[PDB]
Scaffold this active site. Structure first.
Site, PDB file in Angstrom:
ATOM      1  N   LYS A 146       3.568  29.956  -6.871  1.00 32.91           N
ATOM      2  CA  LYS A 146       2.686  28.832  -7.000  1.00 32.91           C
ATOM      3  C   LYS A 146       1.603  28.994  -5.938  1.00 32.91           C
ATOM      4  O   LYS A 146       1.819  29.066  -4.737  1.00 32.91           O
ATOM      5  CB  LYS A 146       3.460  27.544  -6.804  1.00 32.91           C
ATOM      6  CG  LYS A 146       2.517  26.348  -6.820  1.00 32.91           C
ATOM      7  CD  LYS A 146       3.344  25.064  -6.737  1.00 32.91           C
ATOM      8  CE  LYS A 146       2.361  23.916  -6.872  1.00 32.91           C
ATOM      9  NZ  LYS A 146       2.987  22.591  -6.911  1.00 32.91           N
TER      10      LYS A 146
ATOM     11  N   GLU B  18       8.376  36.939  -4.038  1.00 32.27           N
ATOM     12  CA  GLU B  18       8.742  35.510  -4.270  1.00 32.27           C
ATOM     13  C   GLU B  18       9.783  35.381  -5.375  1.00 32.27           C
ATOM     14  O   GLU B  18      10.860  34.752  -5.191  1.00 32.27           O
ATOM     15  CB  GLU B  18       7.471  34.701  -4.607  1.00 32.27           C
ATOM     16  CG  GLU B  18       6.610  34.337  -3.345  1.00 32.27           C
ATOM     17  CD  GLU B  18       7.266  33.295  -2.427  1.00 32.27           C
ATOM     18  OE1 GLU B  18       8.326  32.761  -2.810  1.00 32.27           O
ATOM     19  OE2 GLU B  18       6.771  33.070  -1.289  1.00 32.27           O
TER      20      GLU B  18
ATOM     21  N   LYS C   8       2.327  29.467 -11.384  1.00 37.11           N
ATOM     22  CA  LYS C   8       1.422  28.316 -11.414  1.00 37.11           C
ATOM     23  C   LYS C   8       0.224  28.558 -10.472  1.00 37.11           C
ATOM     24  O   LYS C   8       0.438  28.975  -9.338  1.00 37.11           O
ATOM     25  CB  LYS C   8       2.174  27.059 -10.972  1.00 37.11           C
ATOM     26  CG  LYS C   8       1.302  25.830 -10.864  1.00 37.11           C
ATOM     27  CD  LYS C   8       2.178  24.620 -10.583  1.00 37.11           C
ATOM     28  CE  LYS C   8       1.300  23.489 -10.221  1.00 37.11           C
ATOM     29  NZ  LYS C   8       2.179  22.321  -9.989  1.00 37.11           N
TER      30      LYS C   8
ATOM     31  N   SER D 112      -3.348  20.838 -14.913  1.00 43.77           N
ATOM     32  CA  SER D 112      -4.325  19.785 -15.101  1.00 43.77           C
ATOM     33  C   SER D 112      -5.789  20.254 -15.168  1.00 43.77           C
ATOM     34  O   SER D 112      -6.509  19.860 -16.080  1.00 43.77           O
ATOM     35  CB  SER D 112      -4.135  18.712 -14.009  1.00 43.77           C
ATOM     36  OG  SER D 112      -4.374  19.238 -12.708  1.00 43.77           O
TER      37      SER D 112
END
Ligand SMILES: [Mg+2]
Ligand SMILES: [Mg+2]
Ligand SMILES: [Mg+2]
Ligand SMILES: [Mg+2]
Ligand SMILES: [Mg+2]
Ligand SMILES: [Mg+2]
EC number: 4.2.1.24
Lengths: 328, 333, 333, 328, 333, 328
Positions: free
Chosen positions: B203, B243, B258, B284
């Site tokens: 992310k 990660e 993300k 978004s």
């Protein structure tokens, strides 16, 4: 390849390098520079003219004299190359797309003018029949309305030769006819244009993201030559053919919706690899920034994405704005 | 890859493109409704519906209204929702205690949905950012730095509370080092054997989350603050594999990238290297930019399915997307 | 790699070389100032500057003079310094106690720099060679062999003292087996959560360190001694991957190859196999040989940037280089 | 590929094999031998002549009679091959580089002499126009001063044929014209020179490390044919073409600043792979040793580096000194 | 591998074969004396030398005679010896106690050699087969099966005794599961930090060991017995990688394949997959068959160096070979 | 590829599968069968004749009538193929090797006889000039005594055609001339021999292991065509060329001293891969068994090695003895 090397929390804490600006800079994997940027430009037929484009906020169509004035700034910013897109007068469109190879067609005139005024500026011409056909089809049509492959190539070759004559350092076939890179290459070589680069649109998709471009050039089915968005393995076969055929650079179009394709192409072929952040990507981003929904920083972020995915150069309508941010 | 000496004109790649039937046969990937997860913004109170100017067409909903709307999401075959509570201002604190309140919005919403729609997947958000006064994802030290391990203690309490409410999946979106393992160890200990952990593994410290921060109301809390000491540098690709590797070692059932479209190359690398269930968030800002262009008449409505097909092509198993309903509708019809 | 059947004259690789603009577009790697780490030799005392005959153009500096010079290093955008103290002769001992003295040169220098330039990275040197009478990197047994685990106990104390002084990065240059893990375990225990450990992972028993040993004053201590029982055999490549693998398992945040240009093939293998932050030291002998040739008029000043570009091309994320200032100057202009 | 096999301290202590000379010798991965060494030599036009070179301390230019005298020692040391570099008299330089194929040019005379006196000694001639052009450009120039590709190849082919006639066992094109390996190969085969080796300078970079060479040969832009130092993937395409075109060996130049390139080339192609430790690398090293800044042991160390990186043979000005160290 | 479209007559692979100088330049591998380990059969007593009919030219030697012969092995530059004691019949037992006798032949020989030739490598043999009445490599249960873990307890005592005698390398040739780890754990505990463990990792249940069993005198003990419940099936290749992987995880400093020439494909796979120091035993049967053919005039003496070059080409770092002296002589001259 | 999968003692004990005969059989990776075996045979000129060979104990040279008698047993054992090696009368050896293509040469006569009597038995002829040249050189010689490449190929092609005419199902060029597989292939195809297999000796080394063969055929430098024993990467280039040129099978010779080469060849090309356990390997093994130094079981063990390393078929002088052991 990847070896995890048994790294484990808490001995490994990946936030450590993130702790400070200096360590983030040291480990930063990719950076965007102005030398990664190519600016597409819409070129008008007249003099003393600019026009706004409703679906591409902030982008102007420019007559050649206005193009020369603006290129001073682009050259000052260190932008290495322009990609020229003529806005063909409707009187010059035909079934046979003859305007494509007209020595005094807009693209040919713009090329001569720029090559003379800014000899160090890269000029990438668009090899394509869509700006010159009566309805905007991407080639010569049969009785069923199908875009004939080889007969279209004949016209594309004459066009590419006319661009080379005008002085273009790079020709960029955006047509997606099979075998056209080879045909253009054999013609350039035979004609003695031995240093003219061919930047192939190798993996160009049948995309909804081209909408605003068609407003820009005044050209507003494609699934029979442009690629299905669902297909990834197929892009590798497309690029392999184009490299065998003599391309000096290979391109993926559109851009951000196809970053996985950029990555696979660069990983598999290790050749100069380009990507087009198309009119729809520009419009969505600029729209959101203008509405105050997204911060201006998304511009760099989207461009950084291309670099990280493996792209050597990016055709982007943001090129000048990005160049000014990179500089200061 | 072996090109197998394929050469024009013996190989003409337009032959398979000639007809609909052959394009269909050779089509490499197809989006279905089982790839879709709908994120939802949940308000406190009763009979509340609120528009979001930066996410045109998306509404924050109170639980009662959520339960009504979910009837059509279920009828559409949408497999799961990701719940995002809109914390009232007065419930924000230094210590983010509201995160583990059994009567918090997320907990109440989960209980209500699990009872009404027992087959519907509920993915809860493990994160302290909705609950802090400063809007950062954790507990601050005296230098204003987000403390890693102390924040995990709170995230663990929160994840446990979601499991108690009945959430089938908890999704830590915080980007603390080691939190997947900590949460997994807590779930196992407490007997929550089958609660899935969908890690937000890679992310990025991104600008594309703007409209979401407006939607949940953390924008005013965060102000000009950034998350560069925990969320990843956008420049970094190799780092994503490290990660993911750790999150899998720590027990994640699913791993996520993300944002989504600006990071499709990361989706591809992650699915290729680990061959694990791989998820992607179409965030978004991605939603907002597509909807804006569509409403302006700049892009056709077909971009929606094109953007989602890209995730599938890149290697995603599932996509969190504010387009889930519009997409499921268009796939159904 | 797939050659893709590319063949002259259809493929002419000079076409991209034809113009500056196209060379630029296809350019695979570019050195920036964020790739540069400046090693610095630090003297005791006040208002001290000393030339180094074997490193023409490099000065040992007292802390006061260091603080002055650092103003321009920071103005140039150089992200970090690697500190190398010049231990007074009388402070050298069998037990290397000065290594962990809170009032040692390295510790004093770190405190001064952290206070004056809070954004500047400080990389301290974890090593016993500046502090021993014999000049070897550790504690000797009665056969004159450098004891591995007993030396680590001292290195641990030293690394802890650097963390206490405020060093953001400790860099063990000692080549003891297992010291990365030992130091990491100590840092974690003591609460030094975010102190980075830049391992000298694949550090060769090289002849190119001569001028450095002069610079820090360990040359007379070492005499004719060698480090072949701990530093790596120059012949060995596969062995480097085993060194790196262990350092990553042990918690290193960055891994390093030393020397640099004579070991570019090792840089390449290490970045290719592990995909971790990979550092390389362009050592004193490398500096000296380039500067000598430049001052003789045998090589143009452009070799400096050519030599540094090589590290980037080979896979390095960052380069410790005595050319950092000259390079940052030339990159800036 | 690499598998770490879960090795961990303290069960694994990599210092164990380092403990003693005998175990270090047993596990030692690479060794340099004299059979890895090629000695470049600067050859003068006269008789009874040697000259010192200011920027290459300890290297002499030698007339052919002096070359024959010194080769006795080189042959006694077991050095397998010489690389010949003529020092062209200024009267013999021309726009057309005709001296390149002169049957009585220095390189041709030196080759005949050595082949007769030491029949077992490898002679590698330099195929290149830079020693023979008026200003030292690497080929025939157009009106813009650009080095014409194919027209230069014509001259390089005549030169390569003249070397083969003189008896050279290996010809080594150092020019970086596209396609020249193929052209030279077709000509050697047609002419019946079926065993003449072609050692291609495949990945030769536009480098500052060639400075002292230009002093040595008396020849003192290149970015339009020599490679950008920034580029690694590109070297793979260069070597792939040269192997398809018929090269028996492929070379990377310069040497130590490009060890990563040596490694990639050997790993990808598994073909005989050579590297040039150029005049600038020699000068830097010798300079530092003479100043008393570096120990003489750096010579072997730098040469060992080539072996470890994947090189089969090294063109090095240190060849004789290294041979004497290896022997005793 | 990429063939790079190489094609006759543009590519003629005989061009490099044309001359000695070019064959030499392109030569991929060369055997040196630093690749050689000489196995030696050691008798009890004084002034004892005994011919071995099945190993023509090889002599069992008492320690005094061993010390004399070793003068020329050292003068030849042979880096190491592998010692194999010829246990007197009366010292063989069920419990193999003689294996760890500090006054055993192997222990006495090691002490004598370490004192006389301090730079010469001594590799001791960790194995119970020289000491058992039945000739199997360990302790039998009541079904006559070689017990794994109980045998390791004895091997551990033996390895410890060799370390005490001064052996720089212990080489377990027993093929018990897990013995590398057990022995390593014992050595570490006891402070034998730098004693190397050369694992016989992929040792096959082979017929080529006949002459060795004669040489050490275990042939009459073993009789018609076999070692198929511990030594590997000759048919199996993949299994060798699992053997090696475990030995490396367990702390081996070197891994070995045995026999040698019949298993060159295993040498290649092992070096390719692990990139660790890889050793190979050219066994007694291999020696005997070459020597027999040479003495018959059926094969030229050049086969010796050809057979050894093969090990190098296949990926071996070092070769245990009864030809070590003849080879070192021929390499020297 | 290899993944260790974190297996560790004592959870993993590799002796478990070794505990019992049944589990050893279940996990056994490779087995030798008679269908892996090819028997080389030495064929005399006369009738009613056999001869013993001093350096190959137990191997007989046989006249064709004796060959037909013995082949009954070989066929009964299920041996799929013979490899024929003629013992040329000294009167029939010449500088021009013409006996190689003589329709009534031993190999041609033996082939016709076997093809008629045992139509299902594979006959692999040897394509080679060494049995037919005056001194046993492997081809036609120039003035310097060098084996000319292309001129030797001309003779090898005529020979291969004569074998095809005689009925041979497989021709096996053992000469190591560059490009001969292609030349033989073009000739077989042009002549309509479309199913004649070519079993290339692809990676044949300059070996001391051929000593006893030269006693067997009566033929008793090679480094200019046979491979250097030191070279492994080079074998891949040899096999790649032979497959491109049309080989149906590729071979490595000698055998056991080159098992690593067998493994690499099979791994890289995944093509039918053969190996020759040569006369020297046979002699060493048989010698040791006869001296009572090694048990008879080493025969199977050595043959099992070939299977495990990747070989599809083995040319072995042990074929009949191995066939009888496999059967019972
Ligand atoms: Mg195409
Ligand atoms: Mg994480
Ligand atoms: Mg280490
Ligand atoms: Mg080239
Ligand atoms: Mg084992
Ligand atoms: Mg061949």
């Amino acid at each position: 390849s990847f070896t995890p090397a048994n790294r484990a929390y808490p001995y490994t804490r990946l936030r450590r390098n993130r702790r400070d600006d200096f360590s983030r800079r040291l480990v930063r994997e990719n950076v965007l520079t102005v030398d990664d940027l190519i600016l597409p430009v819409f070129v008008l037929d007249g003099v003393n003219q600019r026009e706004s484009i409703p679906s591409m906020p902030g982008v102007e169509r420019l007559s050649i004299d206005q193009l020369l004035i603006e290129a001073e700034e682009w050259v000052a910013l260190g932008i290495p190359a322009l990609a020229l897109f003529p806005v063909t007068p409707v009187e010059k469109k035909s079934l046979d797309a003859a305007e494509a190879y007209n020595p005094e067609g807009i693209a040919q005139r713009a090329t001569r003018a720029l090559r003379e005024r800014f000899p160090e500026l890269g000029i990438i011409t668009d090899v394509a029949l869509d700006p010159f056909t009566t309805h905007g089809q991407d080639g010569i049509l049969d009785d069923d309305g199908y875009v004939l492959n080889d007969v279209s190539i004949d016209v594309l070759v004459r066009q590419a030769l006319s661009h080379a004559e005008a002085g273009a350092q790079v020709v960029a076939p955006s047509d997606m006819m099979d075998g056209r890179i080879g045909a253009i290459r054999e013609a350039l070589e035979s004609a003695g244009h031995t240093n003219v680069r061919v930047m192939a649109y190798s993996a160009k998709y049948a995309s909804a993201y081209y909408g605003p471009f068609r407003d820009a050039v005044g050209s507003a089915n494609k699934a029979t030559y442009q690629m299905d968005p669902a297909n990834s393995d197929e892009a590798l076969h497309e690029v392999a053919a184009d490299l065998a055929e003599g391309a000096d650079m290979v391109m993926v179009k559109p851009g951000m919706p196809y970053l996985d394709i950029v990555r696979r192409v660069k990983d598999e072929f290790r050749a100069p690899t380009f990507v087009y952040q198309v009119s729809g990507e520009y419009a969505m981003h600029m729209g959101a920034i203008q509405n105050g929904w997204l911060a201006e920083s998304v511009i760099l972020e989207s461009l950084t994405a291309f670099k990280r995915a493996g792209a050597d150069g990016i055709l982007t309508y943001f090129a000048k704005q990005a160049a000014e941010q990179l500089r200061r």
